[PDB]
């Protein structure tokens, strides 16, 4: 039996780090590619976005219909089809080749995140799902440290299209030891099954009209949003504004995803602790006190970094800046994750974590195109500064609802 599990486990956060690798290699290689081809802002967006639009609309149908699907063979699959596009972009030179690989990029991804959630419910009991959903999503923070000084590393000699062309073959290999080793089922190794564990059910119709359903969805969107824009173009604005050179803008993009390992460890471990001392109630979340804490450090970690980095600024002052943007954009992203579930009417538990998915990559969408139009237009600089006023404003909007009814659905 604990054989079983600890194979699968492993496997699965083996897996799961390299689809993101591979979703964001495109960043990692970002500045040699443009050197070799030269590129506008704005082509860059648009490459940055086809792959965004795609992941919504895949993830989103994939859940509805995932109950009808194998996650042996789903994830699998999945991985065969990222490798496979990301062999042959390298070869490809021209822009409008580039875009269309990168939306089935996309698209092949999706199918990567149903899989994942329905082998945690049956092989371990659901007490524990929620630690291993936050061990499972440190899995991209490992991948997305690890990638941009590998980088900026190996393009001394190899060319972009060599350093990308191997995170395809590794691909096909890992997804071909994945088929191997993920079992579906305990029954299916001969293992019994765990064992299976009609109140005011409220309509779907119900659910939408949820003040605090939006409240918490869009202050996802903001967040969300935020943090591509740093992930993709906070290594432009160092090398074209700022003076520095390329290797220190990939060390400012590694500091900043150890910064959310941290974040998300620490955001489970304090908000329960502090729900032990005040408890539960329809109105209000008791952890609102600390999702306000980690958004108001996020709008003003941005705010120095923007300002007081220059030429002149040793490298220790951009990595801590990086670093605790990292703890407190990632640590939100945690807490949204636990307040829906308990928020949620029982009988639509997962319907619920779905509507916030889909707005959720609608932020990661206006990270691409829209906001590299306005740093075309005008700078760099004038594009982050706009990100960092929407970002405070959500702060100001989220404190002043912070005593709104939660609880979703028709209350008696
Ligand atoms: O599904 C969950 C969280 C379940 C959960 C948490 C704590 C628990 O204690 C628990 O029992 C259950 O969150 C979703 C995770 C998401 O799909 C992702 O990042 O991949 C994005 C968005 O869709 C989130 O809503």
Redesign the pocket.
């Given at each position: 039996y604990g054989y079983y599990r600890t194979v699968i486990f492993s496997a699965m956060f083996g897996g799961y780090s390299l689809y993101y690798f591979n979703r964001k290699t495109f960043s990692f290689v970002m500045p040699s590619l443009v050197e070799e081809i030269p590129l506008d802002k704005d082509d860059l967006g648009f490459i940055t976005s086809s792959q965004s639009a795609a992941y919504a609309i895949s993830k989103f149908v994939s859940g509805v219909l995932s109950d009808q699907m194998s996650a042996r063979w789903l994830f699998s699959s999945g991985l065969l089809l990222v490798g496979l596009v990301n062999i042959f972009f390298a070869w490809s030179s021209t822009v409008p080749v580039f875009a269309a690989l990168w939306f089935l990029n996309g698209l092949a991804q999706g199918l990567g995140?149903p899989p994942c959630?329905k082998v945690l419910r049956k092989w371990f009991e659901?007490s524990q799902?929620?630690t291993w959903?936050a061990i499972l999503?440190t899995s991209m923070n490992l991948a997305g440290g690890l990638g941009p000084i590998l980088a900026t590393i190996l393009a001394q000699s190899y060319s972009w299209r060599s350093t990308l062309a191997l995170s395809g073959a590794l691909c096909v290999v890992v997804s071909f030891l994945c088929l191997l080793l993920i079992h579906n089922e305990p029954a299916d190794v001969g293992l019994r099954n765990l064992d299976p564990m009609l109140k005011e059910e409220s309509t779907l119709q119900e659910l939408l009209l949820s003040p605090y359903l939006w409240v918490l969805s869009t202050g996802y969107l903001v967040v969300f949003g935020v943090k591509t824009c740093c992930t993709d173009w906070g290594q432009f604005f160092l090398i074209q504004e700022k003076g520095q050179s390329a290797l220190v803008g990939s060390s400012y993009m590694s500091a900043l995803e150890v910064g959310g390992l941290v974040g998300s460890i620490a955001a489970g471990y304090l908000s329960d602790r502090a729900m032990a001392k005040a408890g539960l109630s329809n109105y209000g979340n008791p952890r609102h006190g600390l999702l306000l804490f980690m958004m108001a450090g996020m709008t003003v970690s941005m705010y120095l970094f923007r300002v007081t980095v220059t030429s002149d600024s040793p490298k220790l002052w951009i990595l801590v800046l990086g670093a605790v943007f990292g703890f407190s954009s990632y640590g939100p992203?945690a807490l949204?994750?636990?307040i829906?579930?308990e928020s949620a009417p029982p009988n639509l538990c997962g319907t619920s974590?779905?509507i916030?998915?889909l707005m959720?990559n609608v932020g990661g969408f206006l990270a691409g195109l829209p906001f590299s139009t306005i740093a075309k237009h005008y700078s760099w600089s004038t594009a982050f500064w706009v990100a960092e006023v929407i970002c405070a404003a959500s702060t100001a909007a989220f404190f002043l609802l912070r005593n709104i009814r939660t609880k979703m659905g028709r209350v008696s």
């Open positions: 995140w959630g659901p799902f929620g959903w999503s992203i949204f994750g636990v829906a579930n974590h779905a916030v998915g959720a």
